[PDB]
Design a protein around this ligand. Structure first.
Ligand code: ZN
Length: 193
């Protein structure tokens, strides 16, 4: 099981998210109270990278999904049979991968030879000078309710910064639910508190 321990490391690495609210029409919205992203299938999910100092050139940013519940965590998170066979390739992503990056031609996908886990990595780009974070646009390509995939089990996304040889520089994580009405579901889940 890949580690999910938060680690800001030397560059002060944190994640940020847009403060999108819960109107019925939002496509992606983040709950700080739950540390949980609610988003729609194949829609843009912005995730911000914030650092206190700039990691060096050749730094990379990897995203991987794991099941949140200890009893499912050893199982590889992948797309259901249906979505795996759907005609929705962007030509870069492997069809079994849950997490894609959109709008980045340098994107690299990995099937880990030993663990069988999937992940997606992009070069780290600094923020524009006087803009304060780097944004990556993720797409989640199955719903949390897909039969034969996640099947309503909750998942985490783990975001790592790594150097050009794959050494760990920083790690954060957040829970994700991929669903039809992220605003409504966020509001409903927050009602429990
Ligand atoms: Zn699916």
């Amino acid at each position: 099981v890949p580690s999910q321990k938060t680690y800001q490391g030397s560059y002060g690495f944190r994640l940020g998210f847009l403060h999108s609210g819960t109107a019925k029409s939002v496509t992606c919205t983040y709950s700080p109270a739950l540390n949980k992203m609610f988003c729609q299938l194949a829609k843009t999910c912005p995730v911000q990278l914030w650092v206190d100092s700039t990691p060096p050139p050749g730094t990379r940013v990897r995203a991987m999904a794991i099941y949140k519940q200890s009893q499912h965590m050893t199982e590889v998170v992948r797309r259901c049979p249906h979505h795996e066979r759907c005609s929705d390739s962007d030509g870069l992503a492997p069809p079994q991968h849950l997490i894609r990056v959109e709008g980045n031609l340098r994107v690299e996908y990995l099937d880990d030879r030993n663990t069988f886990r999937h992940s997606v990595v992009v070069p780290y780009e600094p923020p524009e000078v006087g803009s304060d974070c780097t944004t990556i646009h993720y797409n989640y390509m199955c719903n949390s309710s897909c039969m034969g995939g996640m099947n309503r089990r909750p998942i985490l996304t783990i975001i790592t910064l790594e150097d050009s040889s794959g050494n760990l520089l920083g790690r954060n994580s957040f829970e994700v639910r991929v669903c039809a009405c992220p605003g409504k579901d966020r509001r409903t889940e927050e009602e429990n508190l």
